Design a protein around this ligand. Structure first.
Ligand SMILES: *[C@@H]1O[C@H](CO)[C@@H](O[C@@H]2O[C@H](CO)[C@@H](O)[C@H](O)[C@H]2NC(C)=O)[C@H](O)[C@H]1NC(C)=O
Ligand SMILES: *[C@@H]1O[C@H](CO)[C@@H](O)[C@H](O)[C@H]1NC(C)=O
Lengths: 52, 438
């Protein structure tokens, strides 16, 4: 029981950390385009990441 | 040639010892422990038995008075009573109606059975171990009696053996024990000269034949009833019978580690604890040179059936290619699986059958037929019987090999998660390097 609980917890924290850091990478790649007045994100980068 | 190894101190468990020196074929030793004894050194403190009270005939004096003097006897109690008028079957005993006196005395002495029924009080000290081990190799099969203390050195077919000392100093006996007939007890006892009436040790003697005695039984006299000749006395019953009634539970039915306790002398047998080290010095006549030993090449191993049970639930087959007929030595190099045979006959056909026992779901071990080695991996299913009458013939290991099914699944899951994490790390590092370049 203890081993299963520990393994599940470790898998969950690994998945969460990976997802959060990938989200951070997205948000840091697409952060300057929201600050530039006018202009627009390229369609390719706006497809490989969801760009509002 | 010197060698060293350790064995588990469990009775009946076969143990294979592998030796290997340059320029000779390997040799396999088998040593088994038949029985063990643990004996503590005892110093007697005192003994106890049922007591008896000696009441002599009272002294009655007509028309006079008597006084009585003390004597050096155990619990000597004497009193003089005045104004007594004894009666007998004929009539009165003395003329004087109220000028008489009576002297009554009594004391306590040990029973006439103390030589046959007594309980001893001891004090246990550091204990020694004796063993009876059987050795077997080549064409030698003998059993010897050895002292497991690192001092004894016995020779068996030209080979010196030195056993011990044991890895753990554990003794079931407490500091103070009491021995009676066939049982022993871990109970404290009152110190000599301070016994208490009605309990254990109310009558103490330094030894069986000693002439001194300590008795404290609360012997009180009483005045005789009028018109009668008798000595009355009230005395607390024997403490030895009281102890014999609800002494408690014996160590024989309480000793841990499955230890059989016998007396005369006080000793504990077949205690399963710790592991003994063995040092040996084998001569050059017991080996065989590499030239006159068969050469084995291309050795592979396979397992037919496997059921991890206390018996020898496993059959494995080795295939090989040899050059002459002869006999080799086999051995398993891991404690996961223990073989049954030590020497096997090889021939030109190239197939042998071996029996092994294990306690793991998926065992992995390396066997060795003469100078060649191979690896074995198997999958075993649990047995169905719940209770068995014989002891386990396998070392208790349950951790499966890293290539087993469960560890295989955990490896795949871990690999997938690690790949995802590594990809995320690489993506972040590339994006941040591009961002910093700006
Ligand atoms: C015989 O009996 C007489 C009493 O009948 C005893 O005399 C008594 O002696 C004691 C001891 O000196 C005195 O205290 C009493 O006063 C005596 N009694 C009387 C009535 O005088 C005598 O001692 C007895 N003799 C023998 C040999 O038994
Ligand atoms: C060794 O000797 C004992 C006593 O005769 C015997 O019981 C046992 O089977 C022998 N072992 C072998 C392998 O011959």
């Amino acid at each position: 029981v203890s081993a299963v609980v520990g393994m599940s917890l470790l898998a969950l924290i690994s998945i969460f950390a990976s997802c959060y850091m990938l989200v951070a990478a997205r948000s840091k790649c697409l952060t300057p385009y929201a600050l530039t007045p006018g202009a627009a994100v390229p369609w390719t980068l706006g497809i490989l990441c969801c760009a509002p | 040639y010197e060698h060293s190894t350790v064995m588990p101190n469990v009775v009946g468990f076969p143990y294979k010892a592998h030796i290997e020196r340059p320029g000779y074929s390997p040799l396999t030793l088998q040593m088994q422990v038949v029985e063990t004894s643990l004996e503590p050194t005892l110093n007697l403190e005192y003994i106890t038995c049922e007591y008896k009270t000696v009441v002599p005939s009272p002294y009655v004096k007509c028309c006079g008075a008597s006084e009585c003097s003390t004597k050096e006897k155990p619990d000597y109690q004497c009193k003089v009573y005045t104004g007594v008028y004894p009666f007998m079957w004929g009539g009165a005993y003395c003329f004087c109606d109220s000028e008489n006196t009576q002297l009554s005395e009594a004391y306590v002495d040990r029973s006439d059975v103390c030589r046959h029924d007594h309980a001893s009080a001891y004090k246990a000290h550091t204990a020694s171990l004796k063993a009876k081990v059987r050795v077997m190799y080549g064409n030698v099969n003998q059993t010897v009696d050895v002292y497991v203390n690192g001092d004894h050195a016995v020779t068996i077919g030209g080979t010196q053996f030195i056993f011990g000392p044991l890895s753990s100093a554990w003794t079931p006996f407490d500091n103070k024990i009491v021995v009676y007939k066939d049982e022993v007890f871990n109970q404290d006892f009152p110190p000599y000269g301070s016994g208490q009436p009605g309990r254990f040790g109310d009558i103490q003697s330094r030894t069986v034949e000693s002439n001194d005695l300590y008795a404290n039984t609360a012997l009180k006299l009483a005045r005789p009833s009028p018109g009668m000749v008798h000595v009355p006395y009230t005395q607390t019953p024997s403490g030895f019978k009281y102890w014999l009634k609800e002494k408690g539970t014996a160590l024989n039915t309480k000793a841990p580690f499955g230890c059989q306790i016998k007396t005369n002398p006080v000793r504990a047998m077949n205690c399963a604890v710790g592991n003994i080290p063995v040092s040996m010095n084998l001569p050059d006549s017991a080996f065989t040179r590499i030239v006159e030993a068969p050469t084995i090449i291309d050795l592979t191993c396979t397992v037919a059936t496997c059921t991890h049970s206390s018996d020898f639930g496993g059959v494995l087959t080795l295939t090989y290619k040899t050059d002459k007929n002869g006999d080799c030595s086999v051995h398993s190099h891991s404690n996961v699986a223990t073989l049954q045979e030590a020497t096997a006959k090889v021939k030109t056909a190239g197939k042998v059958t071996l029996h092994f026992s294990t306690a793991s779901a998926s065992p992995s071990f390396v066997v060795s037929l003469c100078s060649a080695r191979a690896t074995c991996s198997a999958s075993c299913e649990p047995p169905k019987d719940h209770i068995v009458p014989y002891a386990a013939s396998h070392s208790n290991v349950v951790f499966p090999d890293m290539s087993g099914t469960a560890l295989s699944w955990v490896q795949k899951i871990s690999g997938g998660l690690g790949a995802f994490a590594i990809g995320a790390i690489l993506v972040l590092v590339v994006v941040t390097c591009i961002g910093l370049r700006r």
